[PDB]
Amino acid sequence: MDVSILGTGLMGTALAQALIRSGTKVTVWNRTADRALPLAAAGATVAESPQSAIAASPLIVISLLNYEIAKDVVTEADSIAGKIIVNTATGTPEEANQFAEWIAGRGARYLDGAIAAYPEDIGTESSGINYSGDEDVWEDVQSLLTPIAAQSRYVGARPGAANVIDAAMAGAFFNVALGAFHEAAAYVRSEDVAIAEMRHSLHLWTDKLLELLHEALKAFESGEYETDQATLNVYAAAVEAWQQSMQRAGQRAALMTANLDNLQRACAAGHGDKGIFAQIETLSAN
Amino acid sequence: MDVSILGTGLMGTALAQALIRSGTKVTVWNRTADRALPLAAAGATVAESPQSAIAASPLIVISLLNYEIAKDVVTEADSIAGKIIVNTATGTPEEANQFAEWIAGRGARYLDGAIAAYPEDIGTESSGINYSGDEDVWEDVQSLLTPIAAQSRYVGARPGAANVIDAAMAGAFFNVALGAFHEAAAYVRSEDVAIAEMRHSLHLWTDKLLELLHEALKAFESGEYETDQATLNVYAAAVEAWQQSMQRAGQRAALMTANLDNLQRACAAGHGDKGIFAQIETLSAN
Ligand SMILES: Nc1ncnc2c1ncn2[C@@H]1O[C@H](COP(=O)(O)OP(=O)(O)O)[C@@H](O)[C@H]1OP(=O)(O)O
Ligand SMILES: Nc1ncnc2c1ncn2[C@@H]1O[C@H](COP(=O)(O)OP(=O)(O)O)[C@@H](O)[C@H]1OP(=O)(O)O
């Protein structure tokens, strides 16, 4: 099954190159189009227009900045009836649900994607894509698309599920954890200790974190938050002492302050004697 | 060189077992002492008293709850002159600096340690210990102690350096990042998406985080925060949109809120067009 890609940015380009290597015939389009020139040389067909790119293939993969631009570009096709549209842009769950419904009312099939991978990672081990929406669609494009990522997974029937997980993992987890590390290193530097002496431990701490994340998920699935060892109360106390150390050292320590606040509410609602994972129970706004 | 361990808790016990396996003669003491019974069977000598345990060995490794208890126990020796004292308790840098000075005034040598490893990890790959204080001491105990952790490192002349790095990595980074993951999963669940569909990506995200941490450290060492790709401004905007999504979904999102605040201050102080690592520059209380 041939495919066309709308968007030859870094990601779009990477998608196109992986698909060529798969042995798939690829047509590309891009709003500028100088950008798509090199892809021509690798085996791709450059199209004059979205309409023309859409018409060329049964499967259209979108890699454009956002959902609004995606909508505007695919509006320029007169017909998409019978086509499979796969939109790999990041965005809100609502964006996905609405895009899905618009696609469906034009007589096209839809699947929504979210890419956890730098462009340069796209053909390799260090690359995953989550997909959500109609499972029948996923079944029809799995073999064609699974090549372009090591770990490709259908994560739910809701069009917006991939976008929810991507926000959660890239935003709520990853970006915040990256910030936490800035607070950490700024703290070390404030105590006149060499930031370099953090370096050799990094992999030990990210390994430990991975094992803990697995364990937190098991506990969130279970409702089993029971002791083991350090309780919420112990953690709350330890975090307060860390916060005070960081402040005495001249750091605002805002993430550490927010963490303490999460821990206290968990304790203050009677979970003080359960394990740290029980902190999940008071993250809601109530 | 024989060693005595004060404290046969889980950690103390683990230290003792590794040292026996090293081929070192070990004497142990513990305040209760039923606890130390099994260690007898593995090859260790149980001592009646701290004084007696101290007298038995040139090198004393402390694994007691905190610095206060450590001080009180070693006060019970009449003499420690000429002994090497290695205190592996976690605590503040000030605790370390003061303990160091007290040890020195009793005519003993000192090194301070911080253990990044669960007890069960102590003899294995997944285990590191940082040491700080007098480098001459480290040189004299390196071969004897390096066995009991895969990655053992001297991290500075300040007695308190190991305690600073441990607070930074265990507290400011790790505990907060673990909290961030609770916010993430609570968010996914709030959007009626299966928390299970986070699981398969975990290792990809902790791998990506590790590479990013390395890169942040390189940038903190350099002062080179320059573009590349996504700027502080883009991040601030993306984080606001994540925060709004999480709140609309009924989550407090306190860590995400604190992260945004860090990002805005960086932008609001004219770093908006540099890369994310420039956020380090406004973490101070000012
Ligand atoms: N307003 C718009 N209309 C149509 N396509 C747009 C667009 N804004 C961005 N794109 C496309 O969306 C894709 C995303 O590009 P980007 O600037 O976000 O980064 P990158 O090139 O790294 O992917 C590109 O294919 C881009 O095409 P251009 O080369 O014409 O910029
Ligand atoms: N007040 C105190 N005086 C002396 N030793 C103490 C102490 N509190 C704790 N310890 C020791 O400090 C060590 C830390 O024990 P812990 O209760 O913190 O956890 P774990 O047993 O997992 O290491 C133990 O060797 C403990 O000895 P006990 O078996 O007598 O509890």
Residue numbers in the entry:
A (entry chain A), B (entry chain A): 1 to 286
The authors write:
RytRedAm catalyzes the formation of a substituted γ-lactam and N-methyl-1-phenylethanamine with stereochemistry opposite to that of fungal RedAms, giving the (S)-enantiomer. This enzyme remarkably uses both NADPH and NADH cofactors with KM values of 15 and 247 μM and turnover numbers kcat of 3.6 and 9.0 s–1, respectively, for the reductive amination of hexanal with allylamine.
In an effort to shed light on the determinants of cofactor binding by RytRedAm, its structure was determined by X-ray crystallography in two forms. At first glance, the cofactor binding motif in the RytRedAm sequence is similar to other IREDs/RedAms that have strong NADPH preference. The crystal structure obtained provides insights into the flexibility to also accept NADH, with residues R35 and I69 diverging from that of other IREDs/RedAms in the otherwise conserved Rossmann fold.
